[PDB]
From TrEMBL, chains A, B, C:
GO terms for molecular function: dUTP diphosphatase activity; magnesium ion binding. It comes from Staphylococcus phage 80alpha. This is dUTP diphosphatase. CDD domains: trimeric_dUTPase. It comes from the Viruses. It is an enzyme of class 3 (hydrolase).
Length: 149, 149, 149
């Protein structure tokens, strides 16, 4: 029908909301400068054939922070946990600071002061970090050709 | 109809040209190694429903330079100024040089010699830095599901 | 018809395979930390009008390695050699190691021990490094407008 199925794999998951669908983190993580990771959404979707999903970066977080989301391509009928392919592309300049930075590049004040690497970010459980955009995909048969028509 | 509306927000803006639409800068800026920014196009568009716009990187500039454009997703019926989400991902190696580099990685000769950080780029007002690609988006209603069909 | 033409430009090329089409390298290359490059596929395609191709990153390699593929936008009816726009975004920390890393971040054991820069990768001729995803593109005529409807 004209409806997309969504399964919540955990009590940490969070239903998407709408043009593109806001995707939420299911875990709290701390990324150091240049650290890679795959953030679990604990959400799965059943995209019908003739469609590919795009788990792509959000504009707010991406423009404001060094959090770089490589757009994931959700294949039609892939039912696994959707993971955010992320890298804190902030330069590892060896410096230190007492402040983590949220997904709005603002400092997180700590009641218990800790020492962090400069350019570190914290993603909180249930935060809007990505979004899902579904678009039609064309799958034709391939033809080995010596020269095009 | 079969026509996309385009509004010029400034005397610095520049009409797009065509497969994908060439987007022009409306400002001259200088990005240091690892500097983030949002370059204003001074251009706005009214994308109809059932379509999402993609303000994505150009092939020439992106392959030739360290100028990294995170593809923007222009939602159907967003009428604001389109901004290029960019980062000069060149490593900040602390070195210095007398040359800025254009969007073709070539050196810019300065009649008035200045000291710049190595790996700096200059985007000129009215230069082709990005392009707009519009594609159909699918928006179905979401259904909370315990298991897929 | 309902068929996409594919031409092999070399004896090093390799036919794509299928949701998205797996793209193979036609050359063996070694990328140092922060090195840019355009990897030749030795493959050309004739995408019909009303469609744009997306030479985008693979999930395995991209999430596992620092190999960053800026998604290429293959315009309808572009018949040139498809090249992978890549950057080894691993930080140039000046360190050295005897191991190259494959597209699975695993160490490559060398029978002839050599000295490499830490965070270097090797792409092998005939490896799955990218994939092609074709989606419909909308090309309307542009209208200069003082205010939207
Ligand atoms: O960022 C991502 C990327 C992929 N994925 C999922 C969706 C997709 O079904 C799967 C990998 O598909 P890709 O086409 O992106 N890469 P791969 O070539 O490994 O998949 P396949 O071999 O099935 O084409 O992993 C994510 O959840 N997040
Ligand atoms: O690079 C960009 C990214 C976004 N934009 C614009 C277009 C879009 O309408 C708006 C942000 O939409 P996104 O879906 O990209 N992110 P966000 O989640 O913040 O928007 P919304 O909350 O409306 O979904 O900003 C740009 O001009 N350039
Ligand atoms: O990563 C890439 C990017 C582009 N290409 C090819 C496909 C495309 O037809 C051509 C460049 O088209 P783009 O729209 O990506 N950039 P450009 O503005 O230079 O092309 P045009 O001026 O024709 O719009 O180069 C690749 O093979 N790999
Ligand atoms: Ni993209
Ligand atoms: Ni970097």
């Amino acid at each position: 029908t004209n409806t997309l199925q969504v399964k919540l794999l955990s009590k940490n998951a969070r239903m998407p909301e709408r043009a593109g669908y806001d995707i939420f983190s299911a875990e709290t993580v701390v990324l150091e400068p240049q650290e890679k990771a795959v953030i679990k959404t604990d959400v799965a979707v059943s995209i019908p054939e003739g469609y590919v999903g795009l788990l792509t970066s959000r504009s707010g977080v991406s423009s404001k922070t060094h959090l770089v989301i490589e757009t994931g391509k959700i294949a039609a009928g892939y039912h696994g946990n959707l993971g955010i392919n992320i890298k804190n592309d902030h330069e590892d300049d060896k410096m230190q600071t007492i402040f983590l930075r949220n997904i709005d590049n603002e400092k997180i004040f700590e009641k218990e002061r800790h020492l962090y690497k400069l350019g570190s970010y914290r993603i909180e459980k249930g935060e809007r970090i990505a979004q899902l955009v579904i678009v039609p995909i064309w799958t034709p048969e391939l033809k080995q050709v010596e020269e095009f028509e």
